[PDB]
Design a protein around this nucleic acid. Sequence first.
DNA 1: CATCTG
DNA 2: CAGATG
Length: 327
Amino acid sequence: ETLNGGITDMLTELANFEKNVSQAIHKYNAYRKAASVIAKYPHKIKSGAEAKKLPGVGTKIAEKIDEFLATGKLRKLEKIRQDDTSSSINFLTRVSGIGPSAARKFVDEGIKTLEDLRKNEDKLNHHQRIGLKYFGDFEKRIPREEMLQMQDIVLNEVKKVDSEYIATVCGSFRRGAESSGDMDVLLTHPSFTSESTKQPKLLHQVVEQLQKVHFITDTLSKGETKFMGVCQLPSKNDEKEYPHRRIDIRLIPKDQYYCGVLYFTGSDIFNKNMRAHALEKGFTINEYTIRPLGVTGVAGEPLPVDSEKDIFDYIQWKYREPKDRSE
DNA sequence: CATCTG
DNA sequence: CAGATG
Ligand code: NA
Ligand code: NA
């Protein structure tokens, strides 16, 4: 946790690089287990050879660990942090909508900066454009003080459209968190479920409302069950407008809300543990449901849930306020 | 995983 | 349709 920290950290730089700059998914994946294992490892790795001893730990990595232990640095790591082509990619990529693939294309065409990009807005697609248009707002955290205002609106608009809608803003927003990166809304309606064959309107009508009153400003992607947009809290009395915020809205069959809600609320740490506990208790749990575990090895059949309560109960556990869903 | 692009 | 992005 801090005993093999640099090692794990250099490994991660390396891994990351493989994958983003190079196309090195194998290699990339290689750095990864290595960091995972040394990361678990209980002692101070005093040498390459010692590391080697571990699985995932091969000769190359061992070499690397040596040089790093030997001297506060790594030449390759040094050579990579410099390199412009590499840097560009880590950069372009900050654009919402530009992944590595594209980052690479562009670089080879010479776009390496915000400016470049602006000049070449023709080469970018809708998501990418938006992404560029709000590069700034996008990287700005979201003070819960705004979150509360957002939430407030979203929920009232849903209410107006249908009394039957059930919205939830999961996220750390939900776990307590002072700020958040984006807004996640979980959505359902009674007349929508597992069997119930679709109802696209279900999600489109709401989206529509939000843009009606202008809460939603742009559309990243809009499918029948998932909507990726951009929104903004109405600028008050002109002098202080708000940054543009990323927002997501998703339709869920009523028959698997709570699992989603639970699930999406995190933290990943809480998940896992709740997850492991369920398993003991003779259960299985995932994004959409909880299933009683058979003995033949495994086994199915959706346990029926009406609140986050039903879930815990099942696994016989202490209902957790979302605040304490930390770990 | 669901959506988009081309 | 494969392949990219989130
Ligand atoms: Na990006
Ligand atoms: Na292939």
